[PDB]
Design a protein around this motif. Structure first.
Motif, PDB file in Angstrom:
ATOM      1  N   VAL A   1      41.483  46.056  36.125  1.00 35.23           N
ATOM      2  CA  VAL A   1      40.859  44.915  36.859  1.00 35.23           C
ATOM      3  C   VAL A   1      40.370  43.858  35.766  1.00 35.23           C
ATOM      4  O   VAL A   1      39.504  44.190  34.948  1.00 35.23           O
ATOM      5  CB  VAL A   1      39.540  45.249  37.637  1.00 35.23           C
ATOM      6  N   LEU A   2      40.884  42.633  35.735  1.00 38.59           N
ATOM      7  CA  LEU A   2      40.321  41.555  34.848  1.00 38.59           C
ATOM      8  C   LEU A   2      39.403  40.550  35.623  1.00 38.59           C
ATOM      9  O   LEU A   2      38.489  39.975  35.027  1.00 38.59           O
ATOM     10  CB  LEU A   2      41.409  40.966  33.921  1.00 38.59           C
ATOM     11  N   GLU A   3      39.598  40.358  36.938  1.00 40.08           N
ATOM     12  CA  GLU A   3      38.575  39.746  37.825  1.00 40.08           C
ATOM     13  C   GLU A   3      38.491  40.555  39.160  1.00 40.08           C
ATOM     14  O   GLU A   3      39.468  41.050  39.702  1.00 40.08           O
ATOM     15  CB  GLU A   3      38.858  38.241  38.022  1.00 40.08           C
ATOM     16  N   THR A   4      37.289  40.630  39.699  1.00 43.64           N
ATOM     17  CA  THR A   4      37.027  41.136  41.102  1.00 43.64           C
ATOM     18  C   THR A   4      36.958  39.789  41.891  1.00 43.64           C
ATOM     19  O   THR A   4      36.079  38.954  41.652  1.00 43.64           O
ATOM     20  CB  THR A   4      35.756  42.019  41.201  1.00 43.64           C
ATOM     21  N   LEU A   5      37.970  39.536  42.733  1.00 36.67           N
ATOM     22  CA  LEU A   5      38.282  38.146  43.195  1.00 36.67           C
ATOM     23  C   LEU A   5      37.354  37.581  44.370  1.00 36.67           C
ATOM     24  O   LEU A   5      36.149  37.587  44.105  1.00 36.67           O
ATOM     25  CB  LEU A   5      39.849  38.241  43.259  1.00 36.67           C
ATOM     26  N   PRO A   6      37.685  37.065  45.606  1.00 37.55           N
ATOM     27  CA  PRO A   6      36.669  36.512  46.549  1.00 37.55           C
ATOM     28  C   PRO A   6      35.752  37.559  47.273  1.00 37.55           C
ATOM     29  O   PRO A   6      34.561  37.639  46.976  1.00 37.55           O
ATOM     30  CB  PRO A   6      37.594  35.647  47.425  1.00 37.55           C
TER      31      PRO A   6
END
Length: 71
Positions: A12-17
């Motif tokens: 995981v590089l971003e945890t998104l909305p």
């Protein structure tokens, strides 16, 4: 049988909305992914740098989704 979806995951590089994953794959490319809908409410919680699954298609390599916990 022929053009089936592969499980082929990432970091995981971003945890998104809401709760999604801008993931760096095992192939070395950045993909947009969600988890598989079902386990979200037995909330199997994850953050920015966890061991995600990310299943994708033969044709559309830019996307993905945490199917069952494999990494």
């Amino acid at each position: 049988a022929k053009e089936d979806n592969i499980e082929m995951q990432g970091t995981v590089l971003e945890t998104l909305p809401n709760t999604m994953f801008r993931v760096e794959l095992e192939n070395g490319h950045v993909v947009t992914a969600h988890i598989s809908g079902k386990m979200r409410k037995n909330y199997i919680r994850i953050l920015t740098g966890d061991k995600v699954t990310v299943e994708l298609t033969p044709y559309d390599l830019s996307k993905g989704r945490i199917v069952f916990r494999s990494r």
